[PDB]
Amino acid sequence: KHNMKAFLDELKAENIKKFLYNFTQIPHLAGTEQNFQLAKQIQSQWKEFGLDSVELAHYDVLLSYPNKTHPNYISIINEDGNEIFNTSLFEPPPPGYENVSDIVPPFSAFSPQGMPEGDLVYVNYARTEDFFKLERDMKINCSGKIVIARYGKVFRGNKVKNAQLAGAKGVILYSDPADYFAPGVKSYPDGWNLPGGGVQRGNILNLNGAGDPLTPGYPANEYAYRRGIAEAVGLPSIPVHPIGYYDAQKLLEKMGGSAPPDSSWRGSLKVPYNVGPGFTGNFSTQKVKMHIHSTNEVTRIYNVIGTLRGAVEPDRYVILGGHRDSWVFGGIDPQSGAAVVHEIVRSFGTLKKEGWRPRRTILFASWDAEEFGLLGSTEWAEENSRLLQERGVAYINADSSIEGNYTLRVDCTPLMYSLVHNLTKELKSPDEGFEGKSLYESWTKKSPSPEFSGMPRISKLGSGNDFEVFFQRLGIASGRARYTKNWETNKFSGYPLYHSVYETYELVEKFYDPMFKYHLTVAQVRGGMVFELANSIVLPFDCRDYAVVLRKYADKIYSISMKHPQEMKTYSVSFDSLFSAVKNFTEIASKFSERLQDFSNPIVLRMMNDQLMFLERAFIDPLGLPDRPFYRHVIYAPSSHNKYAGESFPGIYDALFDIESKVDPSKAWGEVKRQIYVAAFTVQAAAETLSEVA
Amino acid sequence: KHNMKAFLDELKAENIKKFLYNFTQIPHLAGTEQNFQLAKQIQSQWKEFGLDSVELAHYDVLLSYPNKTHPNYISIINEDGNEIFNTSLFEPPPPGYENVSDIVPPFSAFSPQGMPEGDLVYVNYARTEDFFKLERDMKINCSGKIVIARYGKVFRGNKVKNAQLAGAKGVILYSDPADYFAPGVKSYPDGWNLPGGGVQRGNILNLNGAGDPLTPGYPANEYAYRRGIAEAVGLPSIPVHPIGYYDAQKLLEKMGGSAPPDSSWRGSLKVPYNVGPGFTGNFSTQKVKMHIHSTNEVTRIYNVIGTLRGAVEPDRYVILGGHRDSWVFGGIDPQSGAAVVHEIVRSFGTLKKEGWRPRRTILFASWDAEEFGLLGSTEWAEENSRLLQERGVAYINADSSIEGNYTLRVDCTPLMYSLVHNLTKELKSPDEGFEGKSLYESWTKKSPSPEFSGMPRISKLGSGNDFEVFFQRLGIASGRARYTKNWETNKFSGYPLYHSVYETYELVEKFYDPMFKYHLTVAQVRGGMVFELANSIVLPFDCRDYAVVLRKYADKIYSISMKHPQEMKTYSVSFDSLFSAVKNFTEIASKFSERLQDFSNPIVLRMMNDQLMFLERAFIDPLGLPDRPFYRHVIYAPSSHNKYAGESFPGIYDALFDIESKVDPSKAWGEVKRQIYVAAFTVQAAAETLSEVA
Numbered sequence A, B: 001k002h003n004m005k006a007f008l009d010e011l012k013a014e015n016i017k018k019f020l021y022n023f024t025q026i027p028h029l030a031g032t033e034q035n036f037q038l039a040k041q042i043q044s045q046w047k048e049f050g051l052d053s054v055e056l057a058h059y060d061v062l063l064s065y066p067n068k069t070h071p072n073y074i075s076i077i078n079e080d081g082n083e084i085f086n087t088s089l090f091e092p093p094p095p096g097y098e099n100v101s102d103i104v105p106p107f108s109a110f111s112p113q114g115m116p117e118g119d120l121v122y123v124n125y126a127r128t129e130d131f132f133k134l135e136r137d138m139k140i141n142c143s144g145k146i147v148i149a150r151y152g153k154v155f156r157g158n159k160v161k162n163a164q165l166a167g168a169k170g171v172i173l174y175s176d177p178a179d180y181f182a183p184g185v186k187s188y189p190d191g192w193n194l195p196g197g198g199v200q201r202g203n204i205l206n207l208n209g210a211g212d213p214l215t216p217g218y219p220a221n222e223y224a225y226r227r228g229i230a231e232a233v234g235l236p237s238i239p240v241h242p243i244g245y246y247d248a249q250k251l252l253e254k255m256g257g258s259a260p261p262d263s264s265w266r267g268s269l270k271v272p273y274n275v276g277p278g279f280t281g282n283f284s285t286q287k288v289k290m291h292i293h294s295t296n297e298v299t300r301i302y303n304v305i306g307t308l309r310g311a312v313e314p315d316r317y318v319i320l321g322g323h324r325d326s327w328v329f330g331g332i333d334p335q336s337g338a339a340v341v342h343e344i345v346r347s348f349g350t351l352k353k354e355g356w357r358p359r360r361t362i363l364f365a366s367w368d369a370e371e372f373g374l375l376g377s378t379e380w381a382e383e384n385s386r387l388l389q390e391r392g393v394a395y396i397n398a399d400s401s402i403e404g405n406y407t408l409r410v411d412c413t414p415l416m417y418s419l420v421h422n423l424t425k426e427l428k429s430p431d432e433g434f435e436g437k438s439l440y441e442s443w444t445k446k447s448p449s450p451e452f453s454g455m456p457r458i459s460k461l462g463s464g465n466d467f468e469v470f471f472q473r474l475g476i477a478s479g480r481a482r483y484t485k486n487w488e489t490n491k492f493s494g495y496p497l498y499h500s501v502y503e504t505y506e507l508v509e510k511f512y513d514p515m516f517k518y519h520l521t522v523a524q525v526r527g528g529m530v531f532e533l534a535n536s537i538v539l540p541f542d543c544r545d546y547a548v549v550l551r552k553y554a555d556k557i558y559s560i561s562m563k564h565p566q567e568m569k570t571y572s573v574s575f576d577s578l579f580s581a582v583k584n585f586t587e588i589a590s591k592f593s594e595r596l597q598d599f600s601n602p603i604v605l606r607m608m609n610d611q612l613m614f615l616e617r618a619f620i621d622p623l624g625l626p627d628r629p630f631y632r633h634v635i636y637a638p639s640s641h642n643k644y645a646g647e648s649f650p651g652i653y654d655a656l657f658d659i660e661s662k663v664d665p666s667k668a669w670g671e672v673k674r675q676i677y678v679a680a681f682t683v684q685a686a687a688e689t690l691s692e693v694a
């Protein structure tokens, strides 16, 4: 039989291991020759594996690179302008790789050039509320200061935007051991911790879904018209640079001015964590100077696009996509995910060669330049937008397969909750102590739902990965899954060696997954979800699950508003229309489910499968959210304060945020009411797509 | 047999006549009780005629009305402030109607209130090029003047916008006999001409597709959030009022200052047509004073929505829509069209009762408040946007069935050209001298195509009617058809009695169509087009016709650019990408047509019917055109200078218009190139929706 079980059994741990080793011996930075060569290897192998067609799709996009002969660094300088302390020019390379060339040194992609000099202010994680504490309560003015902030909690791009709007003239980012050094474990290469010389790379853009900074709305093809740099989307206006904790201790240990406001501002180094501004009396005439000479450059990138044509609905598309570009070797991010995708293509190709074909079309993607702002996925989607919105069933992401070895993590649309519950009950737990049990049972036990006893936690989608264009711009049902840690020690960050030269094959094979059994389980989850979406006669979405979370999100946003009872009275602020819409959605979804259970007729089928496919699409507003025209989904957007986190009823949440500080309350409460109207209307209009059609 | 011929034969001239008489005995102004009563009569009769369901859909929208106890008028005033001349307060009512109440007096809907006094400037038709002549060549400054302009050539809304941007402080509109009095024919009631006391009503908004001024993007339902008047879309900022030619002769005959620049500025009255400013020496101290006291008011409106459910594809919608609201009796506009729709519902209902059903769903609409800015259609479409864009096959408009008795007029998407050719070859000509010939033969003979010998003229869609939201916002294939005049005498205007109290049942029965045979022919064209769209197994669109007009539009816009050869060299302006895209569209459409001819398989069918339905949809850009976000179609928008006329490649046309006057040529030619890119990309993306799907 050619069924899901044949698909699942053909997947092997040992194949994933081999592919990961093959993908991680040299660096594969976006825009470099070595990343083009790997694209040409993936294309050739997906053809040999059996896919019907495999194409490169190339774009010319804005990327960012250090100057090889004029290196980036930071200094303490004295009254004479002598540089008495210099940060490192490179991470000490790991054992056996000390001769690999073309390792890009640590830098903040898209930093402007500059050499600003000034006094230091310490701003904790540089979150919105850190800057509120500094300015409103401690009365400390960051204007014309250089700010130093610790990585963690929120996306680094939001930190840079916050610092810019507080008047900073530069930003220094560092990895504190409190957030990237787990108690009791050793530093690479003898453990999975971050050493004092290790540094986190990453881009610092605020794109809000735009894609290539020069071509918002349209693909960066051969004849494209480009904005000038001055009108580019999302570039920072002050220089920025990342450092490790040995270097950071040298910048922090002389800090003066005010004491830290409380123990949530203190990391683990042996320094007071004074906020500043500037250094204590003996050193008060010394200063910090940045030297940044990175350049922005239009550079060609290459996506790989494989097609397995459907036997019955070739015009319905189920997409499995993840990126291939890495900061250096990409041992976890992204090659642990790309090796899993490779094995998934190989198993579907095995079945194809014995004569099987899925019911719907499957598209397989190896995205480029994800690390520089989700550019390869966003440009391809802009090119193919009309095809994706009338034919796109679902999108399953496939970046890192592990960030821990404790239990499963799923983030997805409510439409996939029931699918994920049923598949995981059918899979074996790889966990010690759960031999012979289901993945559902071990996951449910280690990560209980906050709401329903006997069910596992499934989170909302945020952003900071390649599903953003599919879900929050086009409104295609999306999900992601990987193995994760128990969020007990460093509960405010990813893994210690994230975006560092120490992220290697050896990191994974020695410390995360020596038997490759967590990788195999994640391949069965991603692959199994794609198999069902592409082969089930009725699409495996349950509209009633959307009805339940919409009631939760409405209770939550009403609760935030009800902290302001006097203003809700004065400006006649009512949530009645939103609760009415959610009630109608609940009742219409219930009746739709009954009909879906009673019906030999392929039109009624294809009509009802189209109602399921177009339900995620119904939550899209073609006018977008305020000042973020590429965030079009009215239920879910990335938090305005943290691109990694999801926010529910984002238009209303943002109208209410910090509303007590607004100068014209009548105007601000007017905009709350406008956002209530838009949300109620949109929920009611989505419910009506599930009514009988005529 | 239940086929198109049974449908067509059940239609009767005598039924249309009866319905027109029934719809035109009292006034049916939007927002009034009498228009609600007629909606309740239409709903009840469409039910009795057999439709499966018939509903009212109501909205609360901004309308505009004169003050009953404080009438609008204009004066000449002397140095003392004595009013020595007053314009009429009402049109002399026609024979037999001199006791009908509730006839709204002539007014410009949505005029602000005011009593400005000043000197007159005469501005011909108030077109863009009239104001260019005045300011650039004659050096006449309209700032702080009252302008008087003759109706004709362009939509009155564009005249008001042009006058406002030239600094006018009020606008007077009049009907000149040169444009509304046909040589050799008598004045109502002894002929179809406009008398000296007759006046054209109409709105003067610049909505650019928004719908209700207070609720752009969203339906004006019970809980809607409304903008304040100051942020409303499209309201004029200076007072405006319409007058007849007896009153106009009194305002024009004393005009002084410069002579008219040439004979295209002179109408037919016995006056010099001096441009001004102000009156000649004896009267040079007299002035013109307006008195305007109309008020804007949120008022309830009612659409009627009838449904005939499809037997095989109930989730595919073919819409027949026209408005019901009138300025006074609506003898031509709109009831000659609404009576035709009534008879069409009755014939489809006859077939339904003998047990027939169309293959696809048919939706029948009686729109409200079209006369106040296409408000009823636009609000319903905003409410139902998600349903219309995934399920909408086509939209057939149905306002006035006649504006003459000479030959047929069709304006439609290229996708319907072949459909219209084949149907008209099957219908009988009602024209004298063509007895026993086809409608195709008589139409082709009286209105030859400018391009192809042996074919009739079919025009592009413009705007100023209820198809605007369906076609230029949502991208649903649209068309319209009616009987028209030979454009020999008044070739720059509709019919003489347009929007006047003289537009009566008697106007039609005595002078336009005494046997109702032109009405019956227009019912067979509209009805026949709806029958085919709803019942043909393969949708009756030919993608190759789009390929041919796209080459025409590209040649045309290139020709406009090539008037500036030196700038095209200096800024590297190339149309190569657009011509490339059009070539690809031609070749892909040709191969698609072959496949559509070779294929027992309903999926391949439904896949190919969806490619045909979504092809018009592919021309939509979700970012809209510059500053006109509700004009989203990249091939067709309403002219920026005249809402009635269509423009092709509108983004490029507007970037090029008057470009030699722009101060920064580099920036202006940069925007031309951006628009070339958007058009090329969009044409290529539309072609690719017709490629094989996988």
Ligand SMILES: *[C@@H]1O[C@H](CO)[C@@H](O[C@@H]2O[C@H](CO)[C@@H](O[C@@H]3O[C@H](CO)[C@@H](O)[C@H](O[C@H]4O[C@H](CO)[C@@H](O)[C@H](O)[C@@H]4O)[C@@H]3O)[C@H](O)[C@H]2NC(C)=O)[C@H](O)[C@H]1NC(C)=O
Residues within 6 Å of the ligand: A577, A578, A580, A581, A584, A680, A681, A684, B222, B223
């Ligand atoms: C959820 O689903 C229900 C459908 O079961 C839907 O109920 C609708 O509520 C609206 C109110 O928004 C009702 O609208 C009324 O329609 C009648 C005519 O049938 C009108 O007469 C009413 O207007 C008068 O009353 C108003 C209320 O005080 C006055 O302020 C106004 O000036 C008028 O005098 C009113 O427009 C509608 O009838 C029901 N539909 C039903 C019961 O079928 C509800 O709206 C849905 N929720 C959302 C968010 O859409």
Ligand SMILES: *[C@@H]1O[C@H](CO)[C@@H](O[C@@H]2O[C@H](CO)[C@@H](O[C@@H]3O[C@H](CO)[C@@H](O)[C@H](O[C@H]4O[C@H](CO)[C@@H](O)[C@H](O)[C@@H]4O)[C@@H]3O)[C@H](O)[C@H]2NC(C)=O)[C@H](O)[C@H]1NC(C)=O
Residues within 6 Å of the ligand: A222, A223, B577, B578, B580, B581, B584, B680, B681, B684
């Ligand atoms: C109409 O249809 C045709 C398809 O039949 C389509 O042709 C495509 O044209 C583009 C040019 O826009 C070609 O793109 C090239 O791709 C190759 C790789 O296959 C690249 O090496 C090329 O880049 C180099 O050359 C450029 C040109 O001078 C340099 O400026 C550049 O820096 C690079 O060195 C280039 O990107 C593409 O191959 C064809 N596709 C084919 C033939 O299949 C055409 O684009 C369509 N028209 C529109 C408007 O879409």
Ligand SMILES: O=C(O)CC[C@H](NC(=O)N[C@@H](CCCC(=O)Nc1ccc(F)nc1)C(=O)O)C(=O)O
Residues within 6 Å of the ligand: A152, A153, A154, A155, A202, A203, A333, A370, A371, A372, A373, A374, A399, A400, A463, A464, A465, A492, A493, A494, A495, A498, A642, A643, A644, A645
């Ligand atoms: O430009 C972008 O949108 C993201 C590019 C890139 N994307 C990623 O690296 N994404 C990783 C992020 C993993 C690390 C992480 O989850 N950190 C984290 C920290 C705090 C918090 F609240 N949430 C997540 C992923 O999705 O697996 C980046 O974040 O620099």
Ligand SMILES: O=C(O)CC[C@H](NC(=O)N[C@@H](CCCC(=O)Nc1ccc(F)nc1)C(=O)O)C(=O)O
Residues within 6 Å of the ligand: B152, B153, B154, B155, B202, B203, B333, B370, B371, B372, B373, B374, B399, B400, B463, B464, B465, B492, B493, B494, B495, B498, B642, B643, B644, B645
């Ligand atoms: O608000 C709007 O968009 C239009 C509302 C209303 N619509 C109409 O009356 N439409 C008529 C217009 C018929 C008269 C006409 O065609 N005049 C005309 C004059 C000059 C020119 F170039 N084109 C058309 C129709 O489409 O049958 C109006 O124009 O005031």
Ligand SMILES: *[C@@H]1O[C@H](CO)[C@@H](O[C@@H]2O[C@H](CO)[C@@H](O)[C@H](O)[C@H]2NC(C)=O)[C@H](O)[C@H]1NC(C)=O
Residues within 6 Å of the ligand: A021, A022, A025, A040, A041, A044, A045
């Ligand atoms: C990763 O695997 C690929 C595929 O096996 C290797 O590329 C092949 O190398 C052999 C020997 O040089 C050649 O015969 C083929 O032409 C290559 N095939 C391709 C590119 O598809 C590649 O060398 C391996 N890389 C590492 C680092 O082990």
Ligand SMILES: *[C@@H]1O[C@H](CO)[C@@H](O[C@@H]2O[C@H](CO)[C@@H](O)[C@H](O)[C@H]2NC(C)=O)[C@H](O)[C@H]1NC(C)=O
Residues within 6 Å of the ligand: A418, A419, A422, A540, A541, A542, A597
């Ligand atoms: C997940 O599994 C459950 C339990 O088998 C499925 O729900 C059943 O579906 C069948 C067939 O439609 C019904 O007749 C049963 O009554 C359902 N049981 C229920 C709702 O408790 C559910 O549909 C599956 N979800 C998917 C495939 O998305």
Ligand SMILES: *[C@@H]1O[C@H](CO)[C@@H](O[C@@H]2O[C@H](CO)[C@@H](O)[C@H](O)[C@H]2NC(C)=O)[C@H](O)[C@H]1NC(C)=O
Residues within 6 Å of the ligand: B021, B022, B025, B040, B041, B044, B045
């Ligand atoms: C137009 O036709 C309608 C329908 O025949 C007339 O309305 C009907 O009038 C009769 C007699 O008063 C009543 O019995 C019905 O209740 C009405 N039906 C409706 C409203 O559906 C209407 O009076 C005619 N109008 C004119 C001006 O002749």
Ligand SMILES: *[C@@H]1O[C@H](CO)[C@@H](O[C@@H]2O[C@H](CO)[C@@H](O)[C@H](O)[C@H]2NC(C)=O)[C@H](O)[C@H]1NC(C)=O
Residues within 6 Å of the ligand: B418, B419, B422, B540, B541, B542, B597
């Ligand atoms: C309009 O009528 C023409 C002529 O009958 C149709 O074109 C023919 O269609 C048949 C059936 O598909 C083909 O086998 C013929 O070869 C076609 N003749 C041609 C193209 O000259 C045309 O399809 C009709 N248009 C419609 C229905 O939209």
Ligand SMILES: *[C@@H]1O[C@H](CO)[C@@H](O)[C@H](O)[C@H]1NC(C)=O
Residues within 6 Å of the ligand: A067, A068, A069, A070, A293, A295
């Ligand atoms: C890199 O740095 C040197 C200065 O030491 C400079 O001359 C060269 O132009 C730079 N390269 C760039 C900006 O790409």
Ligand SMILES: *[C@@H]1O[C@H](CO)[C@@H](O)[C@H](O)[C@H]1NC(C)=O
Residues within 6 Å of the ligand: A083, A084, A085, A086
């Ligand atoms: C830091 O680097 C600069 C430039 O290369 C140099 O002048 C200075 O001596 C260095 N300082 C130290 C302490 O190494």
Ligand SMILES: *[C@@H]1O[C@H](CO)[C@@H](O)[C@H](O)[C@H]1NC(C)=O
Residues within 6 Å of the ligand: A141, A142, A143, A144
């Ligand atoms: C912060 O500093 C600058 C002056 O250098 C000033 O423009 C800004 O208003 C200051 N804000 C304060 C002191 O709150």
Ligand SMILES: *[C@@H]1O[C@H](CO)[C@@H](O)[C@H](O)[C@H]1NC(C)=O
Residues within 6 Å of the ligand: A192, A404, A405, A485, A511, A512
């Ligand atoms: C792997 O699992 C063990 C068992 O709890 C744990 O102690 C170890 O820290 C895990 N490795 C990583 C990298 O989390």
Ligand SMILES: *[C@@H]1O[C@H](CO)[C@@H](O)[C@H](O)[C@H]1NC(C)=O
Residues within 6 Å of the ligand: B067, B068, B069, B070, B293, B295
């Ligand atoms: C109509 O006009 C009179 C003035 O003569 C005024 O009192 C009344 O308020 C007006 N009605 C309005 C503005 O609706």
Ligand SMILES: *[C@@H]1O[C@H](CO)[C@@H](O)[C@H](O)[C@H]1NC(C)=O
Residues within 6 Å of the ligand: B083, B084, B085, B086
């Ligand atoms: C015009 O109307 C005003 C106000 O009703 C009046 O004072 C004046 O006498 C009128 N003029 C003429 C010539 O009728």
Ligand SMILES: *[C@@H]1O[C@H](CO)[C@@H](O)[C@H](O)[C@H]1NC(C)=O
Residues within 6 Å of the ligand: B141, B142, B143, B144
């Ligand atoms: C038109 O008149 C006003 C002065 O009353 C002035 O502001 C404007 O610039 C003038 N334009 C001319 C004279 O060209």
Ligand SMILES: *[C@@H]1O[C@H](CO)[C@@H](O)[C@H](O)[C@H]1NC(C)=O
Residues within 6 Å of the ligand: B192, B404, B405, B485, B511, B512
């Ligand atoms: C009706 O047709 C006749 C025949 O040419 C024409 O002379 C007459 O003017 C027409 N009526 C109208 C209203 O155009």
